[PDB]
Structure formats: C-alpha cells, structure tokens
Amino acid sequence: KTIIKLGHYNSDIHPSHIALQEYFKKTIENETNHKYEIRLYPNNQLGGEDQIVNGLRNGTIEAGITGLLLQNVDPIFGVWEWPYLFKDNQEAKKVLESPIANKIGQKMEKYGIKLLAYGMNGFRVISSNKKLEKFDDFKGLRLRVPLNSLFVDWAKAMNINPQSMPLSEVFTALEQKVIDGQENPYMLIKDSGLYEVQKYIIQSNHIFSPGLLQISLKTWNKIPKEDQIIFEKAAKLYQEKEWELAIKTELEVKDYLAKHGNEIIVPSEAFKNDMVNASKVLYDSFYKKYDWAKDVVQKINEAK
Ligand SMILES: O=C(O)[C@@H](O)[C@@H](O)[C@H](O)[C@@H](O)CO
C-alpha cells in the first residue's frame, strides 16, 4: 500500500483543496482498489511552499500543489506569472491547456518533478493599509512579495519598496508595521484572514498565479503505466472541476469582501495604463537575458 502525502499552502476550503478531496483523492483511491492513499496536507502543514518544492524534488513529499517557485532553479517555469500575460481567467486556462504549457511542464522532470495539472489560484490583487488609486500612490509603499525575484522586480518597476518573505510571515510583518500590504489572489486574501487587517484591496490583476499539481518523479517512477493512467484521469477531472469551482468561488469572495468592511478599488483606465506601461521594463529584460523568451511569448500569444 502506497501512501502519497500531498502538501499545499492554501486553506482546506480553497477550491484546490475541495477539488483534491472530491476528484483527485477519491478517483485514485477508489479506482486503484485502494492501492494508493492520497493524504492531504493543506495550510503549510508539511512546510511552506518552498519546502514543498524541495520535498517533491527529493521524494520525501510525494505530491503537492505549489506556485512557480521552481523558477529560481530554471526561470522558464515562472513565465506564467509574467505581468499582463493573460486577459482573464478563461484565457489563462486556454493557454495553460496548450501545447507550449505542456512542453514547459515536461521540463520539470529534469528537476525531479512530474506535472499532473495546471490549476488556478488566480489573478493577483494588492491589499494595503493605504489607499492606492493612482500610480504616484505607490511611492513609499512597502509591500511583501513572495520568495521569487520576479515579484521583487515587478514591485520595483511600480516604484514600490518590496520585501520578499514567506507567506507565513505576512501577518506578523503587518502587525510590526514593517510592511503596508501584500499581493495575492482574492481567494487567498479571504481564506487567510488577511482581509481583516487590510482595509484596501486594489484590483490590479497584475500577475496570474497558477497552482501546479505535481507528483515527485521518485514516486511516479514506482507507479506502473496502468496506474499512472488512473492518476492522469484523476488529474484531468481535478483540473476541469477546480477551474470551474475557482472561477465560481472567486466571484463569491469578491462579493463577500465588498460586504465585510473592505474598500475595493477598481483602477481607473489611467492607473491601469500606467501600471501596464511600467511593467514593460520587465519584458525588455526578459528578452535580453533569456534566449527562449521571444519564442515562448510568441507561442503563448498564438495559443490565445
Ligand atoms: O504569495 C505567495 O506566497 C504565493 O502566492 C506565491 O509564492 C506563488 O504561489 C508563486 O507562484 C509565486 O511565484
């Protein structure tokens, strides 16, 4: 009997967790005569996101959902979070279901990880103690960013002062007045309780964050193809159901946050355009330092 521990950083009521429970775990456990058990560990129980990545690579954490932190080993994996790459949720899903996304996903095997599905965490918004409604308001702003220099660079391009830290440190950084806010999808902002200590939510949607369902290659190579087909069936069902649930749930969460004291700012056309224009410096740099960037972005655009 094979026990597969599956760790992630989201809440047990995040759509990823619900879909893991109902579709991924159940499909595998039932359709393999209970030969595999998929034990779920939400909310950083098995460690923070970076620890999950490392555990997938060394095999001590057999499965997981993470974002794109493996980009610190090979930057190609971080491409999906480049700013303003996708116009909306449906376009993000369409591109992540395309051949180029599959091909980049396959490259994770070189680093010990088998990718099973691209799911959705969502577009990222800025939460803040300070009202932000025009580009000049970023000056002086101290924002936590994730453990990924892309986000450090993004923040600097916005004239924001970033401080990269693990997600588990955000509450205490706010409480200590070390930062003014952070950025993450709407559902994380609710599920985490960050909304209770962040008056303003600014709907920047600057970056789209996928949640990658992954299995350690060390684990995968012990599973015969007949059984892998069942894991793949479960991952495909997980993916369809998770996108659907995530889109539905995000709309609920947006309404919730409107009605519990938070002030949601939808950027003006000018604020929007200023953010978009400011982000171009990131792409200028990608095209200079990555020999694959021109081709990859072209294929991503062709898949839209
Ligand atoms: O804010 C966080 O901690 C996470 O949203 C990120 O670490 C995200 O999962 C990664 O995709 C960022 O590259």
Side-chain angles (χ1 to χ4, degrees):
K1 195 188 214 180
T2 297
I3 298 168
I4 291 173
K5 300 187 301 298
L6 193 163
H8 68 93
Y9 69 76
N10 276 311
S11 163
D12 68 2
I13 53 69
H14 192 267
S16 62
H17 190 83
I18 291 167
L20 278 178
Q21 293 177 301
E22 290 310 312
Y23 306 113
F24 191 65
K25 176 178 171 71
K26 276 187 189 180
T27 296
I28 286 164
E29 293 184 352
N30 286 319
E31 300 185 22
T32 71
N33 185 27
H34 292 93
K35 177 175 179 176
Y36 305 85
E37 175 171 275
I38 312 300
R39 300 196 74 200
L40 306 184
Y41 289 94
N43 202 21
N44 304 306
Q45 284 170 3
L46 301 177
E49 193 184 359
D50 57 325
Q51 185 161 287
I52 305 306
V53 177
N54 287 327
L56 288 162
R57 301 185 68 192
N58 68 28
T60 62
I61 297 174
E62 297 87 3
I65 301 181
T66 71
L68 310 187
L69 300 186
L70 190 61
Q71 71 87 45
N72 67 20
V73 173
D74 186 336
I76 197 150
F77 303 126
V79 66
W80 317 115
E81 282 173 334
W82 289 4
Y84 308 108
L85 194 62
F86 305 136
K87 83 183 204 261
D88 55 35
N89 290 328
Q90 277 294 320
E91 178 167 278
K93 179 178 182 285
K94 186 182 186 179
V95 170
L96 291 168
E97 289 174 352
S98 76
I100 180 57
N102 180 90
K103 177 176 168 286
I104 291 182
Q106 284 172 191
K107 293 177 160 41
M108 297 183 72
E109 295 170 41
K110 175 174 180 176
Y111 305 100
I113 294 174
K114 169 72 180 187
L115 185 64
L116 295 177
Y118 287 104
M120 166 181 152
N121 285 331
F123 286 96
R124 302 175 79 90
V125 302
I126 300 170
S127 67
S128 180
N129 295 329
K130 293 176 180 163
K131 172 182 267 189
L132 312 169
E133 58 201 342
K134 64 183 175 294
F135 191 80
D136 288 334
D137 292 341
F138 287 146
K139 181 177 280 288
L141 186 66
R142 300 162 308 155
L143 219 61
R144 176 267 182 182
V145 296
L147 301 174
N148 178 344
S149 64
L150 168 65
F151 286 78
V152 181
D153 295 341
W154 164 82
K156 296 177 75 158
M158 301 303 114
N159 206 18
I160 294 168
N161 303 323
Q163 182 163 345
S164 176
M165 62 187 73
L167 181 62
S168 61
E169 290 175 13
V170 173
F171 272 106
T172 193
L174 282 165
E175 196 279 337
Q176 287 172 74
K177 303 184 169 71
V178 173
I179 56 178
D180 299 308
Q182 62 86 58
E183 48 78 62
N184 253 304
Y186 274 113
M187 297 187 284
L188 186 289
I189 291 171
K190 186 193 171 184
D191 289 350
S192 66
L194 278 167
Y195 72 100
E196 293 188 317
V197 293
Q198 298 272 258
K199 184 172 201 270
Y200 303 97
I201 300 175
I202 303 91
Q203 196 177 105
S204 50
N205 296 336
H206 51 279
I207 285 175
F208 182 86
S209 281
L212 279 44
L213 175 59
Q214 294 157 90
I215 184 149
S216 174
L217 197 62
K218 291 176 153 54
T219 291
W220 196 238
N221 288 341
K222 294 173 188 296
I223 299 177
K225 182 96 175 165
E226 286 193 331
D227 287 347
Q228 286 184 352
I229 285 161
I230 296 173
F231 276 68
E232 290 154 357
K233 176 184 179 174
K236 177 177 185 305
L237 186 62
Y238 164 85
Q239 180 169 319
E240 167 199 348
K241 294 291 195 222
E242 195 272 345
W243 276 93
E244 178 175 58
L245 184 59
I247 292 162
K248 178 186 170 65
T249 300
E250 175 176 71
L251 295 175
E252 292 167 357
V253 165
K254 285 180 75 172
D255 191 61
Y256 181 100
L257 292 171
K259 291 168 173 173
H260 285 75
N262 298 93
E263 310 225 329
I264 290 191
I265 294 170
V266 183
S268 62
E269 180 200 350
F271 188 9
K272 220 116 124 263
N273 290 338
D274 282 347
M275 287 191 274
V276 173
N277 287 339
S279 73
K280 172 81 144 48
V281 72
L282 304 169
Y283 283 87
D284 295 340
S285 179
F286 300 146
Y287 295 139
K288 295 198 179 316
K289 65 187 172 173
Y290 302 145
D291 82 273
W292 47 265
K294 183 186 193 321
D295 180 54
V296 170
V297 166
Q298 167 171 355
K299 294 195 197 323
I300 284 171
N301 284 334
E302 293 170 343
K304 293 175 179 180

